[PDB]
Amino acid sequence: VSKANVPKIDVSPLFGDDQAAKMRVAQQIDAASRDTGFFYAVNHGINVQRLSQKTKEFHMSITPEEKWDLAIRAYNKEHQDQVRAGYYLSIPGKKAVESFCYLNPNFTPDHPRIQAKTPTHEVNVWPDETKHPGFQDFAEQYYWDVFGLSSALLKGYALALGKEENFFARHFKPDDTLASVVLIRYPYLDPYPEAAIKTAADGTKLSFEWHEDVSLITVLYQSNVQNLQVETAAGYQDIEADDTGYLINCGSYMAHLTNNYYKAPIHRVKWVNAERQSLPFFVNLGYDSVIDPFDPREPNGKSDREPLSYGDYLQNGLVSLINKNGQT
Numbered sequence: 488v489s490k491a492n493v494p495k496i497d498v499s500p501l502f503g504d505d506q507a508a509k510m511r512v513a514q515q516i517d518a519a520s521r522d523t524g525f526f527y528a529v530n531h532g533i534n535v536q537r538l539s540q541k542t543k544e545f546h547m548s549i550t551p552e553e554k555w556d557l558a559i560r561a562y563n564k565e566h567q568d569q570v571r572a573g574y575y576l577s578i579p580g581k582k583a584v585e586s587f588c589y590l591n592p593n594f595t596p597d598h599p600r601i602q603a604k605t606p607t608h609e610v611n612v613w614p615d616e617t618k619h620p621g622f623q624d625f626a627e628q629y630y631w632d633v634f635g636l637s638s639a640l641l642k643g644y645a646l647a648l649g650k651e652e653n654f655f656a657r658h659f660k661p662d663d664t665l666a667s668v669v670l671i672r673y674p675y676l677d678p679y680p681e682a683a684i685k686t687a688a689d690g691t692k693l694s695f696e697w698h699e700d701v702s703l704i705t706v707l708y709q710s711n712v713q714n715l716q717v718e719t720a721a722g723y724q725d726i727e728a729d730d731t732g733y734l735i736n737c738g739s740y741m742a743h744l745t746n747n748y749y750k751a752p753i754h755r756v757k758w759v760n761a762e763r764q765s766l767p768f769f770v771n772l773g774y775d776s777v778i779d780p781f782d783p784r785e786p787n788g789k790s791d792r793e794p795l796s797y798g799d800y801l802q803n804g805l806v807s808l809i810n811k812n813g814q815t
């Protein structure tokens with residue numbers, strides 16, 4: 488198996504005001520997006536050691552009782568309002584992965600989209616503060632930390648494409664973003680349940696089959712265990728791990744907007760029997776956000792693709808991903 492070219496890009500100029508230095512970052516984002524589709528963001532400023540520590544304490548200390556009380560409706564029929572936010576249980580001897588998903592902390596009962604019961608909007612559920620002291624506080628602050636990094640990255644992508652730096656970021660707002668954090672535990676198990684291992688057409692043992700992300704971009708922290716592969720014309724290539732940087736890739740909304748100039752890379756997760764973390768932030772816009780598609784390859788930039796509102800894209804995309812690769 489070949490190893491993928493995944494450059495490390497110092498993103499710190501995107502937080503400053505040296506415009507030429509921003510353009511040089513933008514050029515590297517362009518190059519990576521038109522090659523394998525992945526890069527690592529370094530010099531991001533986020534304390535990822537604390538992220539990993541706090542996430543481990545939560546996963547290792549939560550009990551079955553608490554998991555039922557937080558479960559999404561796939562696992563608890565009482566919770567008809569929890570389609571996205573909450574706990575995604577493992578099934579001993581059958582499904583190894585488990586995860587906790589939370590949304591914009593500004594989604595409260597006061598919020599007008601919650602009042603209106605608009606699809607894909609939900610109010611977060613949290614464990615009891617006395618059993619997990621400080622967890623909710625940490626997780627809400629992490630949301631805004633990685634929101635900040637993602638805003639900067641979106642300025643980078645706008646400049647890469649020849650647009651003003653707020654082209655994408657103007658639609659990525661704290662009052663209405665549909666972005667999500669998912670805290671995924673991949674356990675060590677001995678014996679490892681055979682039902683939790685898929686075999687690929689090429690013979691590779693997999694935890695999660697091929698997919699495109701439902702996002703604009705995906706901002707991923709993982710612990711230092713190699714697992715991801717990206718599809719190329721010549722076959723799948725391994726992405727090297729780096730537990731100090733963020734792994735960045737486009738989702739299928741970016742491929743729509745750019746007439747596939749920036750593809751959403753197809754990627755998959757190899758089976759590895761090791762205790763590890765996978766912590767994505769899916770950069771999603773607002774429910775009514777629409778960007779006119781364009782084609783960077785043409786001088787006029789005109790594209791025959793139809794504009795698509797983000798909320799419709801997301802509702803369809805989240806269901807399709809379940810039907811294709813299973814309930815996570």
Ligand SMILES: CC1(C)S[C@@H]2[C@H](NC(=O)CCC[C@H](N)C(=O)O)C(=O)N2[C@H]1C(=O)O
Nearest residue numbers: 571588667669671695707756765767769815
């Ligand atoms: C490869 C990934 C990073 S991405 C892939 C898979 N992704 C999803 O199911 C999308 C979750 C969306 C979330 N509930 C929401 O409402 O926004 C997952 O989990 N996987 C991760 C993994 O297994 O590491």
Ligand SMILES: [Fe+2]
Nearest residue numbers: 698699700754
């Ligand atoms: Fe993915």
